[PDB]
Design an enzyme around this catalytic site. Sequence first.
Site, PDB file in Angstrom:
ATOM      1  N   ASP A 141       0.812  -1.205   0.079  1.00 49.89           N
ATOM      2  CA  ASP A 141       0.124  -0.025   0.018  1.00 49.89           C
ATOM      3  C   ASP A 141       0.838   1.269   0.115  1.00 49.89           C
ATOM      4  OD1 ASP A 141      -2.444   1.561  -0.027  1.00 49.89           O
ATOM      5  OD2 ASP A 141      -2.726   1.306   1.987  1.00 49.89           O
ATOM      6  N   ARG A 145       0.190   9.166   1.176  1.00 54.01           N
ATOM      7  CA  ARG A 145      -0.926   8.967   2.611  1.00 54.01           C
ATOM      8  C   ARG A 145      -0.215   8.055   3.681  1.00 54.01           C
ATOM      9  NH1 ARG A 145      -3.587   6.573  -1.389  1.00 54.01           N
ATOM     10  NH2 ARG A 145      -3.378   4.174  -1.220  1.00 54.01           N
ATOM     11  N   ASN A 146       0.809   7.221   3.208  1.00 53.07           N
ATOM     12  CA  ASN A 146       1.513   6.462   4.163  1.00 53.07           C
ATOM     13  C   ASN A 146       2.752   6.774   4.648  1.00 53.07           C
ATOM     14  OD1 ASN A 146      -0.717   4.522   4.926  1.00 53.07           O
ATOM     15  ND2 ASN A 146      -0.485   3.403   3.013  1.00 53.07           N
ATOM     16  N   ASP A 159       2.769   2.768   7.574  1.00 45.81           N
ATOM     17  CA  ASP A 159       1.482   1.991   6.945  1.00 45.81           C
ATOM     18  C   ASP A 159       0.451   2.314   8.087  1.00 45.81           C
ATOM     19  OD1 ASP A 159      -0.537   0.276   5.846  1.00 45.81           O
ATOM     20  OD2 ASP A 159       0.630  -1.297   5.439  1.00 45.81           O
TER      21      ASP A 159
HETATM   22  N1  LIG Z   1       3.203  12.769  13.569  1.00 43.52           N
HETATM   23  C1  LIG Z   1       2.968  11.554  13.707  1.00 43.52           C
HETATM   24  C2  LIG Z   1       1.878  10.770  13.161  1.00 43.52           C
HETATM   25  C3  LIG Z   1       1.768   9.515  13.364  1.00 43.52           C
HETATM   26  C4  LIG Z   1       2.828   8.610  13.628  1.00 43.52           C
HETATM   27  C5  LIG Z   1       2.598   7.383  14.006  1.00 43.52           C
HETATM   28  C6  LIG Z   1       2.702   6.202  13.951  1.00 43.52           C
HETATM   29  C7  LIG Z   1       2.583   4.651  13.838  1.00 43.52           C
HETATM   30  C8  LIG Z   1       2.398   4.206  15.109  1.00 43.52           C
HETATM   31  C9  LIG Z   1       2.316   2.473  15.143  1.00 43.52           C
HETATM   32  C10 LIG Z   1       2.674   1.992  14.000  1.00 43.52           C
HETATM   33  C11 LIG Z   1       2.817   2.747  12.701  1.00 43.52           C
HETATM   34  C12 LIG Z   1       3.115   1.933  11.194  1.00 43.52           C
HETATM   35  O1  LIG Z   1       3.323   2.546  10.352  1.00 43.52           O
HETATM   36  N2  LIG Z   1       2.517   0.461  11.254  1.00 43.52           N
HETATM   37  C13 LIG Z   1       3.194  -0.505  10.111  1.00 43.52           C
HETATM   38  C14 LIG Z   1       2.512  -1.526  10.081  1.00 43.52           C
HETATM   39  C15 LIG Z   1       2.849  -2.441   9.343  1.00 43.52           C
HETATM   40  C16 LIG Z   1       3.802  -2.163   8.302  1.00 43.52           C
HETATM   41  C17 LIG Z   1       4.409  -1.069   8.326  1.00 43.52           C
HETATM   42  C18 LIG Z   1       5.636  -0.590   7.419  1.00 43.52           C
HETATM   43  F1  LIG Z   1       6.707   0.023   7.858  1.00 43.52           F
HETATM   44  F2  LIG Z   1       6.235  -1.589   6.610  1.00 43.52           F
HETATM   45  F3  LIG Z   1       5.374   0.273   6.504  1.00 43.52           F
HETATM   46  C19 LIG Z   1       4.261  -0.049   9.480  1.00 43.52           C
HETATM   47  C20 LIG Z   1       2.757   3.890  12.601  1.00 43.52           C
HETATM   48  C21 LIG Z   1       3.896   9.360  14.005  1.00 43.52           C
HETATM   49  N3  LIG Z   1       4.042  10.878  13.956  1.00 43.52           N
END
Ligand SMILES: Nc1ccc(C#Cc2cccc(C(=O)Nc3cccc(C(F)(F)F)c3)c2)cn1
Length: 287
Positions: A141, A145-146, A159
């Site tokens: 994805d 936006r991600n 994500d």
């Molecule tokens: N200003 C801001 C606003 C928001 C945040 C945040 C945040 C946050 C918290 C927990 C999990 C994730 C996440 O991306 N999970 C996730 C799950 C599966 C795979 C991947 C992959 F990295 F592969 F893309 C990532 C993000 C920080 N700062």
Amino acid sequence: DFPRSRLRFKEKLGEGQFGEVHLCEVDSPPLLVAVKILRPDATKNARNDFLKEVKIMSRLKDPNIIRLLGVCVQDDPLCMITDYMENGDLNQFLSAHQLEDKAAEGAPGDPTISYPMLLHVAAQIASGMRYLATLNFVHRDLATRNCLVGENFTIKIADFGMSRNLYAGDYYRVQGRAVLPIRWMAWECILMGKFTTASDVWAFGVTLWEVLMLCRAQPFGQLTDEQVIENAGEFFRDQGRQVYLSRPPACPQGLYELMLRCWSRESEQRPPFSQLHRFLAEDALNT
Ligand SMILES: Nc1ccc(C#Cc2cccc(C(=O)Nc3cccc(C(F)(F)F)c3)c2)cn1
């Protein structure tokens, strides 16, 4: 494991896939972190998904991928702790800028962005995707936006899932089926529903298009979801009737031809992320 008692919750930053993200202060060795916790309506199924997300994120260790700083102790309610990205969502960030008219003419803080900075942003995304490819990790994805923005235009891939109201129009929903980001999806993913590193390259091409558009329009924005899906059938039949995103105003032809290679019918003809990163960091500076 980090004791939950050391956290001070300050404001809500948004929703994630299986939780909600709060800005928190930490006193111990005024530091700010982002903390994801279970939603107030969380069920047994949401908790399971949350635990698996922690496991996924523990694989990821790269300057341009989000990182897990810690988790809460076993007796505590579940939390994930990550870096607070000061400038937030990349789509909302780029939406707030316009391309500079004359180079290096403004004061620090002006709501403008240079063409080399757009390349710097896209190069960082390509470097994070190069890293995931070395783990044979498929994101599924990729889109602005991600991605998240920190200080000095540092970019991390993240994500946040497919259920946020703000981006609902970016996903195609049919009862009983997986939700699909069809305007970012390679033709073989639309037709057969499976994802690879080569389809991540296709999505990177769409993400690069977004960056050069400064997120001012949706991909294929004047076409319906049904037309975007039919376009995948035209890639399959291969009779010269498929259509592509157009060249952004900020995008020179040489960079556009690289974007077009990301959308090759054959997966093996799409450029690897190592080559996309090298173009964006070096060749794209040529006149
Ligand atoms: N200003 C801001 C606003 C928001 C945040 C945040 C945040 C946050 C918290 C927990 C999990 C994730 C996440 O991306 N999970 C996730 C799950 C599966 C795979 C991947 C992959 F990295 F592969 F893309 C990532 C993000 C920080 N700062």
